[PDB]
Amino acid sequence: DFEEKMILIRRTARMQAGGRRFRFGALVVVGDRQGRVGLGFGKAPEVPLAVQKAGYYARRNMVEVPLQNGTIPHEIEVEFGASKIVLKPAAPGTGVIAGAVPRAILELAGVTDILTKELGSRNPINIAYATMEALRQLRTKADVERLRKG
RNA sequence: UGGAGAGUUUGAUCCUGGCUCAGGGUGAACGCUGGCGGCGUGCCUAAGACAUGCAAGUCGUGCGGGCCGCGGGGUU
Ligand SMILES: [K+]
Ligand SMILES: [K+]
Ligand SMILES: [Mg+2]
Ligand SMILES: [Mg+2]
Ligand SMILES: [Mg+2]
Ligand SMILES: [Mg+2]
Ligand SMILES: [Mg+2]
Ligand SMILES: [Mg+2]
Ligand SMILES: [Mg+2]
Ligand SMILES: [Mg+2]
Ligand SMILES: [Mg+2]
Ligand SMILES: [Mg+2]
Ligand SMILES: [Mg+2]
Ligand SMILES: [Mg+2]
Ligand SMILES: [Mg+2]
Ligand SMILES: [Mg+2]
Ligand SMILES: [Mg+2]
Ligand SMILES: [Mg+2]
Ligand SMILES: [Mg+2]
Ligand SMILES: [Mg+2]
Ligand SMILES: [Mg+2]
Ligand SMILES: [Mg+2]
């Protein structure tokens, strides 16, 4: 019912009297490939707990994507921190052309053909957040004419 | 009908930032190896120096001759 894929898993370290102590963080995307996505970043002393916590947080933070024949309705451009994401719709038969993070996020959203570009900072966390905000700032023609009813 | 990034400054982080890699290309060369054919291509350097052969001539339907040879005439 819900597909789950991890973006990256890292081990951070805090200093304490005696040495360094490690804590694992993990990004996880969840999607039904029908138009709903979810991104989560979980931290835990061990890797499996971090993955499970990231899955929970991802399922808690969902985004409804307005797919239009497997692609996006309009080109977007989002700056999250120093990381820029550029999305652009593509005709079918093109495929998803993106970095690892945006490819995973868009594939779990149900996108089949899209053109992307990462600019500025290539940080996977910030790129993921920028892609999520990009999918969140998507508007359909129905939404546009709904905002201009008056 | 068109756009993917990654490694690397830190104990860990974010940023700035350079370096490097994955791609495509060549009138290429070098190493190891090397079976066939078709089509292309082959002094990028000394516009340095060149043996040798060929590469620009052709018209007797423009004209008069030389040399070699033959035939027929004027003459017993
Ligand atoms: K901003
Ligand atoms: K690192
Ligand atoms: Mg929406
Ligand atoms: Mg900025
Ligand atoms: Mg940069
Ligand atoms: Mg177009
Ligand atoms: Mg068109
Ligand atoms: Mg860099
Ligand atoms: Mg320093
Ligand atoms: Mg170090
Ligand atoms: Mg420090
Ligand atoms: Mg190359
Ligand atoms: Mg190459
Ligand atoms: Mg040989
Ligand atoms: Mg050879
Ligand atoms: Mg040949
Ligand atoms: Mg030849
Ligand atoms: Mg030359
Ligand atoms: Mg050249
Ligand atoms: Mg004439
Ligand atoms: Mg003569
Ligand atoms: Mg005679």
Curated annotation (Swiss-Prot):
Query: Pfam families under this entry?
Result: Ribosomal_S5, Ribosomal_S5_C
- A biological process (GO) annotation for this entry? translation
Specify the superkingdom.
Bacteria
Listed InterPro entries: Ribosomal_Su5_D2-typ_SF (IPR020568), Ribosomal_uS5 (IPR000851), Ribosomal_uS5_bac-type (IPR005712), Ribosomal_uS5_C (IPR005324), Ribosomal_uS5_N (IPR013810), Ribosomal_uS5_N_CS (IPR018192), Ribsml_uS5_D2-typ_fold_subgr (IPR014721)
> Per its record, what are the GO molecular function terms?
rRNA binding; structural constituent of ribosome
Statement: the UniProt record of this protein carries the keyword Ribonucleoprotein: yes
Query: For the S5 DRBM domain, which residue ranges apply?
Result: 2-65
- Could you list this entry's UniProt keywords, alphabetically sorted: Ribonucleoprotein, Ribosomal protein, RNA-binding, rRNA-binding
Looking up NCBIfam families in the UniProt record yields: rpsE_bact (TIGR01021)
Q: What does this protein do?
A: With S4 and S12 plays an important role in translational accuracy. Located at the back of the 30S subunit body where it stabilizes the conformation of the head with respect to the body. Binds mRNA in the 70S ribosome, positioning it for translation.
Note on domains (UniProt): The N-terminal domain interacts with the head of the 30S subunit; the C-terminal domain interacts with the body and contacts protein S4. The interaction surface between S4 and S5 is involved in control of translational fidelity.
- Describe, as the record does, how this protein assembles with itself and its partners: Part of the 30S ribosomal subunit. Contacts proteins S4 and S8.
Q: What protein am I looking at? A: Small ribosomal subunit protein uS5
